[PDB]
């Protein structure tokens, strides 16, 4: 059975609203190492995380997912030299700002793809690596968009589809994967944000008038999903529950 | 009832395998103008297109969809100075090469989004424009991936999701939209191509063992879908036919 006990986890975007709560939730278990990679530099959050569980070593490295893949490789080299093995990679970076088209795509899709691609060099069983687990943070918008943020939603559709494909490639690579797709979660991401071409200037207000869940509840279900360790899962973390999507079979390549 | 008669159409990627056949099919109708934008330079094809229908004016402009949006704006300014009005925009650029991660995303999703965003400056009714129609070329891989090209399939998932959102924004912008999503079509795109991290080196050979359709049949159904002019349609152009797809409602924002 899978357990987080004595595991080495890399958490990209571990200091954000959902990230920090998920990091705190993870530290209730006796991981060996929790390595947080983020562009947020918050020494006080790191101090808090180090204080939760004395049995876990918490390390922070500054990281911007939009750098070229060679730079990600350089940092992974440093982290694998420090840890030797990495069991789980959580790719959680995301921005919500449809005024930033290039950056939305670079952070939410390209960066996630590149960190995954870069860690496959250390883990791919075809290269003699040990395999690994990838947990990608998608979004319910990858199933059905928030149409007022069309660019963002399309990036999340890409993450869901890409992750489902990674899971189908597990037999070849040895790396399993799944998405955790939160519903609307109360963080700074959704407190105030820009709709594409300002189609809906009151998008944040309108969205937050409907049901949401706190980041603590999302984090609880995020770690429960990790512990279930189900390759190919399309987990939905909405309104405080943990559910899973049955993706519609519209077409099949035959291969 | 919508008609292509006397319309002005901009077709990005109108000279490729599907593109050129669709351009020929469009010229069976009495368009006012067909403006082909592509990075392919094929003067013989442009002369051939001009000769199909003497009532239509065919103009070619070299164009690479990966340029920054301000460049696309400069080109569109020129086309609107040339023709005054544009009725339909077809975004059809695509590459299939999972060894080119950044370029696959830049061509298949970012470029499409940018051309759409640039033309909205001219068409958005909130900018005093006349509205318009956007036809985006997706792919069946946006419904269900070819998992051996996970980066490409994710880009197409993004196009389908983004286009659906454009259609929901029509009441605000005046710009309607739909995707045409071909199944496997016999063009040079699929004769030989690279899988992500070479997970499947014989991906083209394996895929081509399964059913494919001619690009001419795809083109016939592409123009039929344009003539149906259904805002929000998700068209599947597979095995020589045209069918709508009903997208599953897994989640709803409430707005
Ligand atoms: N809050 C919500 O309603 C939902 C959030 N999501 C996703 O959850 C994840 C976290 O979102 P929240 O915690 O709500 O937002 P947030 O804004 O508090 O956190 C975003 C996280 O991404 C990191 N990040 C952003 N750009 C980065 C870059 N270039 N390099 C490295 N890290 C970068 C931030 O520093 C932070 O760790 C994102 O992937 C978001 O798209 C999914 C669905 C719902
Ligand atoms: N052939 C197939 O099985 C399928 C094709 N598709 C899509 O259909 C479209 C056409 O593909 P095919 O005709 O089969 O392949 P193709 O390789 O013959 O045509 C690709 C087209 O995209 C253009 N393009 C590529 N990069 C560009 C750039 N940077 N700027 C401007 N134009 C650029 C090419 O010059 C050409 O017009 C693409 O969007 C492709 O993803 C969708 C599903 C099935």
UniProtKB/Swiss-Prot annotation, chains A, B:
Top-level taxonomy: Eukaryota, Metazoa, Ecdysozoa, Arthropoda, Hexapoda
Regulation of its activity: Inhibited by 2,2,2-trifluoroethanol and pyrazole.
Recorded consequence of changing residue 132 to I: Complete loss of activity
One Pfam family, short name: adh_short
BP GO terms, sorted: acetaldehyde metabolic process; acetyl-CoA biosynthetic process from ethanol; alcohol catabolic process; alcohol metabolic process; behavioral response to ethanol; ethanol metabolic process; NADH metabolic process
Family, similarity comment: Belongs to the short-chain dehydrogenases/reductases (SDR) family.
Record-listed E.C. numbers: 1.1.1.1
Substitution effect: residue 152 to F/H/E/Q: Complete loss of activity
Gene3D superfamilies: NAD(P)-binding Rossmann-like Domain
InterPro entries assigned to the protein according to its UniProt record, in alphabetical order: ADH_Drosophila-type (IPR002425), NAD(P)-bd_dom_sf (IPR036291), Sc_DH/Rdtase_CS (IPR020904), SDR_fam (IPR002347)
Keyword 4Fe-4S among record annotations: no
Protein's name in the database: Alcohol dehydrogenase
Entry keyword set: Acetylation, NAD, Oxidoreductase
Subunit structure: Homodimer.
Any single GO CC term annotated in Swiss-Prot or TrEMBL for this entry: cytosol
Residue numbers of N-acetylserine PTMs: 1
Binding site for substrate: 139
Protein residues bound to NAD(+): 11-40, 64, 156
Signal peptide: none
Molecular function GO terms recorded: alcohol dehydrogenase (NAD+) activity; aldehyde dehydrogenase (NAD+) activity; protein homodimerization activity
UniProt enzyme class: oxidoreductase
The keyword Membrane is annotated on this UniProt entry: no
Catalytic activity line of the entry: a primary alcohol + NAD(+) = an aldehyde + NADH + H(+); a secondary alcohol + NAD(+) = a ketone + NADH + H(+)
């Amino acid at each position: 059975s899978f357990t987080l006990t004595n595991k080495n986890v890399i958490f990209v975007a571990g200091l954000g609203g959902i990230g920090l709560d998920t990091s705190k939730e993870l530290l209730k278990r006796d991981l060996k190492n929790l390595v947080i990679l983020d562009r947020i530099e918050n020494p006080a959050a790191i101090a808090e995380l180090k204080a939760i569980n004395p049995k876990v070593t918490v390390t922070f490295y500054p990281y911007d997912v939009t750098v070229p893949i060679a730079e990600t490789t350089k940092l992974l080299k440093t982290i694998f030299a420090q840890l030797k093995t990495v069991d789980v990679l959580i790719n959680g970076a995301g921005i919500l700002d449809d005024h930033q088209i290039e950056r939305t795509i670079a952070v939410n899709y390209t960066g996630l793809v590149n960190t995954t691609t870069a860690i496959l060099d250390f883990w791919d069983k075809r290269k003699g690596g040990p395999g690994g687990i990838i947990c990608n943070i998608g979004s319910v918008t990858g199933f059905n968009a928030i149409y007022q943020v069309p660019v963002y939603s399309g990036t999340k559709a890409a993450v869901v589809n890409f992750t489902s494909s990674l899971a189908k490639l597990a037999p070849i690579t040895g790396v399993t994967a799944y998405t955790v797709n939160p519903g609307i979660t109360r963080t700074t991401l959704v407190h105030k944000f820009n709709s594409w071409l300002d189609v809906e200037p009151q998008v944040a207000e309108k969205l937050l008038a409907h049901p949401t869940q706190p980041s603590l509840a999302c984090a609880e279900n995020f770690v429960k999903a990790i512990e279930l360790n189900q390759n190919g899962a399309i987990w939905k973390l909405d309104l405080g529950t943990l559910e899973a999507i049955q993706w519609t079979k519209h077409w099949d390549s035959g291969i």
